Amino acid sequence: LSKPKTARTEQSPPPPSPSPPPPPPPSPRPPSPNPPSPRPPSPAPPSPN
Amino acid sequence: YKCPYDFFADRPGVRQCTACPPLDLGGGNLVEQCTEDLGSQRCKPCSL
Numbered sequence: 001l002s003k004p005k006t007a008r009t010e011q012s013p014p015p016p017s018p019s020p021p022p023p024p025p026p027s028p029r030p031p032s033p034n035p036p037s038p039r040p041p042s043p044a045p046p047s048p049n
Numbered sequence: 050y051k052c053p054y055d056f057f058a059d060r061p062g063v064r065q066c067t068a069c070p071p072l073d074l075g076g077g078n079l080v081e082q083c084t085e086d087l088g089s090q091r092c093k094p095c096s097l
């Protein structure tokens with residue numbers, strides 16, 4: 001070949017830039033709903049006459 | 050006599066064989082040329 005390996009005048013290219021990071025884990029979750037309220041007491045029956 | 054191993058001749062009546070010339074591809078590079086057989090009338094690049 002006409003221009004041998006000593007005549008190659010182009011500087012070499014850089015190495016590959018590093019690979020990106022992975023994604024994050026799945027986020028947690030919003031705390032579920034506390035169970036419903038306890039119904040109040042009940043009116044004691046009619047007093048006597 | 051047969052031409053020597055790296056010499057060649059093409060004309061019939063010759064008083065001496067001629068050495069194979071180098072092959073010119075460009076500036077300042079020459080590929081030397083050899084011969085395949087003993088008595089031959091043409092030279093090829095000696096690398097291949």
Ligand SMILES: *[C@@H]1O[C@H](CO)[C@H](O)[C@H](O)[C@H]1O
Pocket residue numbers: 029030031032033
């Ligand atoms: C608390 O609430 C979240 C909301 O989706 C989830 O269901 C959990 O299972 C529960 O305990």
Ligand SMILES: *[C@H]1O[C@H](CO)[C@H](O)[C@H](O)[C@H]1O
Pocket residue numbers: 008009010011012013
């Ligand atoms: C890096 O690449 C260049 C090509 O421009 C050249 O071949 C160098 O010899 C090599 O090290």
Ligand SMILES: *[C@H]1O[C@H](CO)[C@H](O)[C@H](O)[C@H]1O
Pocket residue numbers: 014015016017018
């Ligand atoms: C990433 O890195 C390579 C070499 O490590 C190169 O310089 C790139 O320019 C860069 O983006």
Ligand SMILES: *[C@H]1O[C@H](CO)[C@H](O)[C@H](O)[C@H]1O
Pocket residue numbers: 016017018019020
């Ligand atoms: C991730 O990226 C770089 C190039 O950006 C390289 O190819 C690594 O091999 C890959 O893991």
Ligand SMILES: *[C@H]1O[C@H](CO)[C@H](O)[C@H](O)[C@H]1O
Pocket residue numbers: 024025026027028
């Ligand atoms: C769950 O993970 C994601 C990561 O991107 C978020 O930012 C928080 O770390 C959390 O909500």
Ligand SMILES: *[C@H]1O[C@H](CO)[C@H](O)[C@H](O)[C@H]1O
Pocket residue numbers: 039040041042043
């Ligand atoms: C009275 O008390 C509560 C309400 O005040 C509930 O409904 C009971 O069933 C009733 O007896």
Ligand SMILES: *[C@H]1O[C@H](CO)[C@H](O)[C@H](O)[C@H]1O
Pocket residue numbers: 043044045046047048
């Ligand atoms: C009759 O019963 C009621 C209960 O609510 C109350 O104690 C009265 O004082 C009683 O007379």
